[PDB]
Amino acid sequence: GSELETAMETLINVFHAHSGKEGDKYKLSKKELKELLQTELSGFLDAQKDVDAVDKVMKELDENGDGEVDFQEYVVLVAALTVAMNNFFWENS
Amino acid sequence: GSELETAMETLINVFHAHSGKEGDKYKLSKKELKELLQTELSGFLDAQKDVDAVDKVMKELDENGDGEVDFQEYVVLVAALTVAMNNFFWENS
């Protein structure tokens, strides 16, 4: 697998790293996820703390706050935050 | 410099690489995405070419063929395959 595939596995491993914490073969719940998202995206989190996008994503995850959050749901949360800030990196470069 | 941050940025680098190819300052045209997704996730794809999920995952992005597909669209697409493929990792293991 390519770097992305490795990266995605890395995401999976992290996702799994949390699934174990909550107690699922493969799932993430809104409990580890909040901590996980801040934990992993410490850099992104800190950079756009006051940025609306984080709330919107946070809220969007809150919408997806019914119970469990899956890998696809997990990646978009980090991705959205990643792009949100990164988009500023593109625009503000 | 978290793994996720690195991993997500790695996705960005690839996304940026393709966005440069597609031409947008930051978007991905479906021109690249099929080539990119199959190419970059060759191992993931190879692991699950015949898997139905890839068809649907591949196609379901047609809806995101409205104009283009970007990092937010891109990450889910690879992640979707990743979860589909990695599902085998968890279950078959």
The domain that contains B57 carries what CATH number? 1.10.238.10
How many domains is chain B built from? 1
Please state how this structure was obtained.
Answer: NMR
To test the contact with chain B by mutation, choose from A6, A10, A11, A16 the residue with the greatest count of B C-beta atoms within 10 A, namely A11
Upper half-sphere CA count for residue B32 (Cβ side, 13 Å)? 23
Residues in B closer than 8 angstroms to A72, CB to CB, are 76, 79-80, 83
Integer Cα distance of B83 and A11 in angstroms? 10
Q: What angle do CA A74, A59, A50 make, to 5 degrees?
A: 100
Tokens 């995401």, located at residue: A11
Integer Cα distance of A5 and A25 in angstroms? 21
Integer Cα distance of A90 and A16 in angstroms? 31
| Residue B66 known to bind ligand | yes
Integer Cα distance of B6 and B4 in angstroms? 5
Residue A40 contacts residue B3 (beta carbons within 8 Å): yes
Integer Cα distance of B82 and A72 in angstroms? 8
Residue A88 contacts residue B12 (beta carbons within 8 Å): no
**3-state SS record for A46-88:** HHCCCCHHHHHHHHHHHHCCCCEECHHHHHHHHHHHHHHHHHH
Q: Which helix (H) or strand (E) holds A2?
A: none
The CA distances from residue A25 to A83, B15, B77, B82, B87, in Å, are 29, 30, 22, 16, 10
Tokens 């580890």, located at residue: A32
Domain, as residue range, for A4:
1-93
Residue B28: beta bridge partners? B69
Alpha helices in A2-51 (DSSP H): 3-22, 30-40, 42-47
| Residue B73 known to bind ligand | yes
Upper half-sphere CA count for residue B37 (Cβ side, 13 Å)? 27
Question: Residue A13 has which token pair?
Answer: 């491993």
